[PDB]
């Protein structure tokens, strides 16, 4: 079964549309058979019967609600208020009882077994496109501690992120990435941009691992008609078209 | 002086165009306080008049002629005759009265030292965006060496460039590069693509050491208006004006 109890991929979920790709991305690494556990971090703007969707794929849909006093980002929050969503993002920490776990945005799609991934060690990335000296926060290996939370929540509080996100505040923290350890470097099929030389892609493509669509328009945001298996607007759409197979196939007769 | 004789960056000019782009890069180099040599490899499409305009700047002018039946690439011009260009840049490995080498392009500006990146290895290079586990070949420290250059004849023979240039080429080669060794991996500033996430640039972009001028236009292909010290359309518009301002200062007054 899912018998690897103490690793876990971990996601994100702050409202009803981004927990459809949680959704996706659920199934996505079941039909590729992970052994490792199924996690969402929810908030409270996500919907209660959508929250129970969830549970038919995670093992875990664990609530975080920042605007609770008695949350642990709560007084970061109070100085950071534009930070809410990467404080949300940075309780991926706090699951302590896995030694190690896969984060994954949920607007990634799984292609492949990405258990090999569980080799490797915090933190591990794959570069960004664009500035590629800083890791892309998409999908990153990390060891679970109370410790490294409270780093992380320390400077969000001290220096904010450059980028407004949890790109920035993780590369600072980390910042050690572009130049030590090769191996802390998750190849490209790993966290695959959409947005990405097609020459590069004729070649390297068929071999990725992961998707990640990133950019304002979002897989669920498409209008996608059922009967033609296609959506109204996708360079490589076999990804998008792939997102919507999986949803209609795969998703929607889970709660019945 | 220049005393460092055993090392040097290397240039590509096949026409006058390109030729101005080396005349802006070599000036940038001494600017700087290289204490390397400057070498172009130039092409017999490059007139004789710009010639003697590049011996100015440069300590060898060397003639490359792959049309030439006596040309070592020229048995692989006539099996790849779409890789000219390609093939006259490989020529930067025939160089053996030089232990080390940085190529770089002649749509690149230097904007510091760089002579630190004699301290690096064959093949050192930065990654390029958008496919960040290739290395982009704008910038690159390499050994040169008849056997490699062969090795590299052999690659273009027997596969093409999977991107019609030396890029894919020499990703191929060195397929090793984004798996082994991060000294291998030049810091991003070290081959600034001007296309390049503008919160990162926000922090990073200061400490640009050189800046790749990608894409279709390049510096002189833009109507400079010396008056106003602008051009006619630019994210980042120090490093054009930087170019211009290298450009009718310091290489204008050197044929006189
Ligand atoms: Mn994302
Ligand atoms: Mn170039």
Redesign the pocket.
């Given at each position: 079964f899912q018998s690897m109890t103490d690793q876990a991929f971990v996601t994100l979920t702050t409202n009803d549309a981004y927990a459809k790709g949680a959704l996706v991305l659920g199934s996505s690494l079941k039909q590729h058979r992970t052994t490792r556990r199924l996690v969402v971090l929810a908030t409270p703007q996500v919907s209660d019967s959508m929250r129970k969707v969830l549970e038919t794929v995670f093992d875990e849909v664990i609530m975080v609600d920042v605007l609770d006093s008695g949350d642990s980002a709560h007084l970061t929050l109070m100085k950071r208020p534009e930070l809410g969503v990467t404080l949300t993002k940075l309780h991926c920490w706090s699951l302590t009882q896995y030694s190690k776990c896969v984060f994954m945005?949920?607007?990634?799609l799984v292609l492949a077994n990405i258990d090999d991934l569980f080799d490797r060690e915090e933190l591990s990335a794959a570069p960004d496109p664009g500035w590629p000296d800083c890791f892309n926060s998409?999908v990153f290996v990390y060891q679970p501690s109370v410790e490294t939370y409270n780093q992380l929540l320390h400077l969000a509080s001290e220096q904010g992120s450059f980028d407004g996100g949890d790109q920035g505040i993780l590369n600072t923290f980390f910042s050690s990435w572009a130049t030590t350890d090769i191996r802390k470097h998750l190849p490209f099929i790993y966290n695959l941009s959409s947005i990405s030389y097609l020459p590069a892609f004729k070649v390297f493509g068929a071999s990725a691992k992961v998707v990640?669509?990133?950019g304002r328009v979002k897989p669920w945001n498409y209008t996608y008609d059922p009967k033609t298996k296609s959506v109204k607007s996708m360079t490589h759409p076999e990804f998008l078209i792939l997102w919507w197979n999986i949803f209609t196939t795969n998703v929607l007769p889970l709660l019945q």
């Open positions: 945005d949920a607007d990634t998409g990640h669509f990133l």
